[PDB]
Design a protein around this ligand. Structure first.
Ligand SMILES: [Mg+2]
Ligand SMILES: [Mg+2]
Ligand SMILES: [Mg+2]
Ligand SMILES: [Mg+2]
Lengths: 384, 384, 384, 384
């Protein structure tokens, strides 16, 4: 279960580089130079790294400082063969964004958020990123009067529409992926789930340029089934990136390493990504716990990739098992895939076997055999 | 705070008629004749009643029994002046639907679900209903292998598309409202939130025929902000019906009377419905607690309407208060409503006040004044 | 991973016998004769069965009917070698208990609840049960004025004290195990967690006669860590019974088969029970999903036992691995087990290495190595 | 609804002094001198202030710096008439406590935690505090192998026992109040609820010296009913302090001003505190949202006190209303307060009206009238 860059595992700079500051605690680790993280991740068998503008270039940097930071980073990428598939903007840390970036009540802040983002899209393209993530983590409210959500959605559409116009105007080959989260750090966040984000995207001027970036833990913070949400995204053709991590239920955003948290959901996720042939990178957005030193940091990142690979093997063995293929037919998963009424409406209305002569009790007496199927899945996961 | 039929308050038959059976308990009340509920609700000042096919006509009824049940019901409606604005199908109670109706793995069940629904659409139109609700409460799974969600969404689209073709083919003036719920009775339910349902609707062959029917408690069972979700539905133009009730947090679906549960969220909901000029009926989907006798049943229903009316008065007084109007400007709610960049992209890119000369620290130092605003809202709610 | 009666696996009659009625659905299975469940469970390798009074003897039964039901049941137990380690009373199903049994506001109901329970304690002793469970599932409220919780706790203490006096007065060798649940079917249930129940027990007249019966799913419905709660119960010496099942997070009580739900928590539970040498039976309180026929019922029950046995093997291999024993020392689990100050208070106050000369920064720089340890645990669970 | 120091409202220094740093954000406010907070709070009508050692004296301070900080603080208290009823130790912020204070796996850290606490108990007594709070916010784990909870509870008992021995040995008049929290910042925290903390306390060498300090939001983060928990604490005689704030459901710890969050639960809490005659201070542990400037900070604190006072008036009017007193009798709240069997066990066993002649159906048919009662409570809360 050794990763190679062929597995397309990617990590944010802000993941392994998290210093360990939390709402109740100071940093437990020193800051990492992005150069050293590139090198360390490459040695573990990662394929690439991603970044927020402010992870790579300190906020307030001069043109000349900005150029140096990027130069050094590009040299580490060239020294290792690491790629940058994705970038994103920090619209959440600085106090100016305390009420939002794109949906800040202050219009001047909204304009500044757009300009900060556009500056970073140019950088992303320069580094070869083809996906640009937006996580509106400050877009929302703690109280009901502070934000009119209809006006905010108008502002959010206008921002995303302006970005689309920009990338179109530059001829850039980049698409956007909107990252939903239900809460934290705001009391409630706008576009709280994959579904709200998919629906929002269908109202944009150029919907083909935008997809979702679902994160395991964010959906699980609302008690939702992350595999189900990913399936809806895939069904829609809008899964443009994915963030992998662990989460133990409905609480603060834990960002555990992928595989920790809800292990069976992590199995069904890998099963789905692999069976759908998802072609994007397997991106980890996690935090090594503040209890850890740097050795524990690199062990944590390695564990993300290892767990993916074990689950990939177990899911592949599950689908390939003749006994599972038989159970899947016993549970009528093959019938779920057939059209309900390819014969058409009128034929359905004229079919007495669909109503007048349908034996509801015999249909009702047929067991689904789902427990046998699920026990086979558990035996495969556990290698029993 | 006395309701009149002008207030357009409606109730499901299955609400006041709930006998009190729960997963751990037998019925505590006898069955109500829909005639008696019509009369009792009219006396309390309700405007109308709604129904599942099986609330009005016992499952398995002959043509002649079906005709009698409907006759008697129509006579109560004519005796009282009560309307039927909405109907829906029961695709959840009978054992045949144990794995779904429209997304049952068994294709024969899917065809029967469609036919049962189409039969009830004809009845609804006959009674004057202009909205038809669909709550796929059995559509989902307890385990990951039992349902391929992409195949299920294909089946769900095909069902809703067939229904749309039917109503179009009959020239009926009725629209559909899809009711999301995240779980219960399935482990996870397909289209779990307002957002997932809005996004689904945009993939149907005739999206204009379908909206959402959000229910207070269903969104709150995922820890989501129900006013925020309603605002997104309104923004989309897809709020085709609403279900009002109470819920105390993330647990089983309580169906408390509207006003119980999350009282401040109920205030911000009424504020939003009234300020948006929502024109649909104020429909209550609640259960009088099994502790209650019939006197408590009618008190519970009366309390739904009373609480709405009190909250309507308090929200209206909040928005009309000059001191609140001033606080709203202090918090820049007027600025949230202005376009971010009506000047256009190029002008935003050339505006140095948006970036090079933007004073981020002075912007950041400006307080939002949201606590003053929220305390005014609390003072109004409480009449302090 | 084949169970034998030596493994001491037990099942409630109401588990495999659940007909599949839920709040939104009719029964999907016919009723099982307790005789047939005894036989079927014995064939699967169970050790015993447990019961509510009303699972074994229909409510309202004559003396002569009651005698026949018990006779037949005793014959199945004698035919199979199955034991009855535990019984309990149904104080929740019948409408009379709609506001409680022991804490019903109506005093006459409280007296009847006591008498119904005492009648069943005599039966339990007759069948050889040494543990008597009490689950006050109706003890609680949907609204704040309906129950004064201090008066209710007085009533609950008086009931448990009366029961203690009874068993003492009869010389019976039986102890009680109070089963906490945070909600469902009441809005909030009294003694909602293991902790509330442990604390309550310390106020009873004879605390040695009472322990807790924690259930996996009940603690998880409050988002609590079930292994942690069990460790507190063990630390207190009050783990008198345990109920094993699965639950996917904070939602209605799912009662999935043990092993489904939170798989890693199920691993750490088995690890703890086995390492503490818990000597009680491994009791399953689960419901085969209503999707299943009887073949699926027996597969579900078999899966409970199989999953326990797989997890027992994986936890045993984890603790026995020299590399895990080394990681446990690297993480200072051996130091957690040593007394903080066996030297005494005065020596701690006079120890400059504890304060004036304590190097806080060198202590703070030491990593805990918890991610390495946890990845070893994950590798063992998965057999990687 | 103007507070006076007679109302005994208290605030932590760390409340109004919170700079606004969160897991995703930098500080939005400058640091407050504790002198200025004392003055500002006194002007708003607060009675007192509380503190962590590190809120008043910067970590690492010399003896001479420590003396100056305390001097200045004492001068503000003398200038205003503000009291210090309570203090507590910071065992969570500094990196040295990343795995705990009293239950850190490293024994040297455990000894340092004790000494840091003992130093602050001496200060507290010097300032006149009679309650000392302990919030073990780092005591817990993100993973199952990192903490053996039985060993940790042994360490926690030993620490609390040592503290008890210290205060006894000094003749100090101070008691301890243990503050439960279910999670955050640890994945799961030891003693997660009021119940776990009450039960723990009964195992200490001198249980009379320890009580609980329940916080509204902490219980609500587990979805528990905070009034119910407070009633159990009162019933036990262990409510030694209380922390008041707001929380909207199961999510990260919001620390909203008291009255925001779950408004009806805040009503039933005040009802209970006032009706039980709780004599401790009404302590607010909240954070003014980071959106606010200092004007919003003082408005937020004022709003805590105002909301308490409004709710106190509404609860008092509810209990004093003859129509509510009648409803309370209709719902048999008077009967809940009577002993179930003051006649004794033998008389209960010989009473045929408790079993053989008990009419279960007539008992079952009696409605509880709880909805009428609850609507009266809602009308009072809203002043309708
Ligand atoms: Mg992310
Ligand atoms: Mg509904
Ligand atoms: Mg149980
Ligand atoms: Mg606190």
């Amino acid at each position: 279960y050794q990763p190679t860059p062929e597995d397309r595992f990617t990590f944010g700079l802000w993941t392994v580089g998290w210093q360990g500051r939390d709402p109740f605690g100071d940093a437990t680790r020193r800051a990492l130079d992005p150069v050293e993280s590139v090198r360390r991740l490459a040695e573990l068998g990662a394929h690439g790294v991603t970044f927020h503008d402010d992870d790579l270039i300190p906020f307030g940097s001069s043109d000349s400082e900005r150029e140096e930071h990027v130069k050094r980073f590009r040299q580490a990428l060239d020294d290792t063969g690491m790629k940058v598939p994705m970038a994103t903007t920090n619209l959440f840390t600085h106090p100016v964004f305390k009420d939002g970036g794109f949906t800040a009540n202050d219009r001047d802040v909204r304009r500044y958020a757009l300009r900060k983002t556009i500056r970073n899209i140019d950088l992303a393209v320069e580094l070869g990123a083809e996906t640009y993530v937006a996580w509106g983590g400050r877009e929302g409210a703690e109280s009901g009067g502070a934000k009119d959500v209809r006006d905010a959605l108008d502002r959010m559409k206008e921002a995303f529409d302006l970005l689309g116009e920009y990338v179109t105007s530059q001829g850039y080959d980049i698409r956007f992926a909107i990252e939903p989260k239900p809460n934290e750090p705001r009391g409630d966040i706008l576009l709280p789930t994959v579904g709200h984000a998919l629906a929002f995207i269908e109202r944009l001027e150029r919907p083909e340029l935008y997809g979702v970036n679902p994160e395991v833990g964010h959906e699980q913070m609302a008690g939702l089934n992350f595999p189900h949400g990913i399936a809806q995204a895939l069904w829609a053709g809008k899964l443009f990136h994915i963030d992998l991590n662990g989460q133990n239920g409905i609480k603060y955003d834990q960002d555990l390493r992928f595989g920790a948290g809800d292990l069976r959901a992590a199995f069904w996720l890998v099963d789905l990504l692999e069976s759908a042939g998802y072609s994007g990178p397997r991106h980890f957005d996690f935090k090594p716990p503040r209890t850890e030193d740097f050795d524990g940091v690199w062990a944590s990142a390695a564990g993300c990739m290892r767990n993916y690979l074990i689950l990939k093997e177990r899911a592949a063995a599950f689908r390939a098992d003749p006994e599972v293929q038989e159970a899947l037919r016993a549970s009528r998963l093959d019938e779920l895939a057939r059209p309900t009424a390819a014969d058409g409406l009128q034929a359905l209305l004229d079919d007495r076997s669909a109503f007048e002569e349908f034996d509801v009790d015999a249909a009702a007496a047929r067991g689904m055999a789902f427990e046998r199927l699920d026990q086979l899945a558990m035996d495969h996961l556990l290698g029993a």
